[PDB]
């Protein structure tokens, strides 16, 4: 059982959420992060002075899935989230030993 972290452009949340919900991936959690590089600078101004920004607003989707579903879930997110030009983001897949649900106590795991 594995965790998919997807750092994506914030406005893409809805498009991603839909894709994941169509894949029957109901359990996702989102956090606000900033990513490096920057990619592109910039220019920019705010009102005298003018400035450059190295850390751009991105969103981190976390979902956990079965090992079989990963390849699919990845492909769907990619399709949903990508926009051609730089800053599209990246996806990290990592392992998870078990998940427990607080309301009921239900332990899940597809590994022994």
């Amino acid at each position: 059982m594995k965790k998919i972290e997807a750092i994506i452009r914030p406005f893409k949340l809805d498009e991603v959420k839909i894709a994941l919900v169509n894949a029957g991936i109901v359990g996702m959690t989102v956090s606000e992060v900033r990513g490096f590089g920057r990619q592109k600078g910039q220019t920019e101004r705010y009102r005298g002075s003018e400035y450059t920004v190295e850390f751009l607003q991105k969103l981190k989707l976390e979902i956990v899935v079965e090992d079989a579903q990963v390849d699919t879930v990845i492909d769907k997110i990619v399709a949903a989230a990508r926009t051609g030009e730089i800053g599209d983001g990246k996806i990290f897949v990592s392992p998870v030993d078990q998940t427990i649900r607080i309301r009921t106590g239900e332990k899940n795991a597809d590994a022994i």
Binding site: R9, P10, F11, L13, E32, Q57
Partner: protein
């Protein structure tokens, strides 16, 4: 051009379009859906509007929107 903004209640907001000149329209990312007419200011970055209002504002911006001259200006007035 992506521009985001934190509302104190509804958290992160994403830019729909620019109504100025000075004003810009924003919408809730976590809620579906609320709209805000942002400006600054002040002295404290500054107001909510219903979706029908918002829908209208984007329309007339959309019209405007889709949609040499200096050379003429210089030739005509300078």
């Amino acid at each position: 051009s992506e521009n985001y903004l934190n509302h104190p209640t509804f958290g992160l907001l994403y830019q729909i379009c620019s109504f100025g000149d000075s004003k810009e329209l924003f919408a809730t990312l976590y809620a579906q859906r609320l709209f805000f007419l942002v400006a600054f200011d002040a002295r404290g970055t500054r107001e909510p509007i219903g979706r029908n209002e918002a829908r209208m504002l984007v329309d007339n911006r959309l019209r405007q929107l889709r949609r040499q001259l200096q050379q003429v200006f210089k030739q005509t007035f300078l």
